[PDB]
Design a protein around this ligand. Structure first.
Ligand SMILES: O=C1NC(=O)C(c2cnc3ccccn23)=C1c1cn2c3c(cc(F)cc13)CN(C(=O)N1CCCCC1)CC2
Ligand SMILES: [Mg+2]
Ligand SMILES: [Mg+2]
Ligand SMILES: [Mg+2]
Length: 323
């Protein structure tokens, strides 16, 4: 059924190879992982549930040989990571339309996941597939994802370090899908800046870099992150962090930095929820009928909200997001 070739090379468990479905001629990605004798594979189980324009499609799966599970998923040629490095090498800002398009599609995917009670727990530019020609974006790498409900205890040391919520580094074991929302803010920040917003050398240093920009959380704020004292540090205004990028650039910066602030709240419950975030005016340009990609092509799918998405959006956000 498959012609398997070329390992694509993930930085997590399993091997992912490019392959061709000989039934369809379509290039696919196949993730091979060790399958447990007794337990279901949680990644596959989650993949079987997800049907969303901004989540990699589950195409097939089969068992090989313990044994191996092979998860056949749709193939997308690039990642937000790779797009960003281009612009970094060209010493160029990512165009605001692309930042808007990627942030919107990442919020939709994660909104859907959270509607199913699923926490992705590894949101990062490497895990966000993109096809440059259409600027579609799809979430992938569900190897760390978990069906999470509040009151559940889980591993603390869980995201990739730059995108890791502050409650996780403060040893919270009962966290929420809000940790994915902090990662969204970090990706937005990285799109605006060109380089990771908070780039710690260790997980503790990650927290310190966060505190150095946002400032010291109050003791009240500390208990929203872990109910179980930091030095006082002058925080930095966002207009200070992004000053070089602002100089070299609509009220897009006011809108982006408002959105940035609401994703990156210390208090996990105060972070702006992904589907509500879609109604932010930062995305108004995506809802204009005349808007096209910088190359002139049409926008990708943006307004095809599923029943489950709409049932998790305030009525105010529903009327705003459907044009
Ligand atoms: O097409 C796909 N369908 C999937 O499900 C899927 C997939 C499954 N697991 C992961 C983990 C991370 C990223 C993507 N995936 C891919 C998939 C698509 N590329 C992949 C690359 C490596 C890889 F290992 C898997 C894939 C290379 N690449 C990329 O930009 N990189 C590689 C990782 C660090 C730098 C960013 C361009 C396309
Ligand atoms: Mg099981
Ligand atoms: Mg099969
Ligand atoms: Mg939501």
């Amino acid at each position: 059924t498959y012609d398997i070739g070329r390992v694509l090379g993930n930085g997590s468990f399993g091997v992912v190879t490019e392959a061709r479905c000989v039934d369809t001629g379509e290039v696919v990605a196949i993730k091979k992982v060790l399958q447990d004798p007794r337990y279901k594979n949680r990644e596959l189980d989650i993949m079987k549930e997800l049907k969303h324009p901004n989540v990699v499609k589950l195409i097939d799966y089969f068992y090989t040989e313990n044994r191996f599970l092979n998860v056949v998923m749709e193939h997308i040629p690039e990642t937000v990571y790779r797009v960003m490095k281009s612009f970094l090498r060209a010493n160029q800002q990512v165009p605001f339309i692309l930042i808007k398009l990627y942030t919107y599609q990442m919020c939709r995917a994660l909104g859907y996941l959270h509607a199913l009670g699923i926490c992705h727990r590894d949101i990062k530019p490497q895990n966000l597939l993109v096809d440059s020609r259409t600027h579609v974006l799809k979430l992938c790498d569900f190897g760390s994802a978990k069906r999470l409900v509040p009151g559940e205890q889980s591993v603390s040391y869980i995201c990739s370090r730059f995108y890791r919520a502050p409650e996780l580094m403060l040893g919270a074991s009962e966290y929420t899908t809000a940790i994915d929302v902090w990662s969204i803010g970090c990706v937005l920040g990285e799109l605006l800046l060109g380089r990771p917003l908070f780039a710690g050398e260790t997980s503790v240093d990650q927290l310190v870099k966060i505190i150095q920009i946002l400032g010291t959380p109050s003791r009240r704020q500390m208990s929203t992150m872990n109910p179980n004292r930091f030095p006082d540090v002058k925080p930095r205004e966002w207009k200070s962090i992004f000053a070089s990028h602002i100089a070299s650039t609509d009220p897009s910066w006011d809108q982006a930095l408002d959105l940035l602030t609401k994703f990156l709240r210390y208090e996990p419950g105060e972070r702006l929820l992904p589907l509500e975030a879609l109604a932010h005016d930062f995305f108004d340009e995506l809802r204009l009928p005349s808007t096209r990609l910088p190359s002139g092509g049409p926008l990708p799918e943006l307004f095809t909200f599923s029943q489950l998405e709409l049932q998790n959006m305030s009525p105010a956000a529903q009327v705003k997001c459907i044009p």
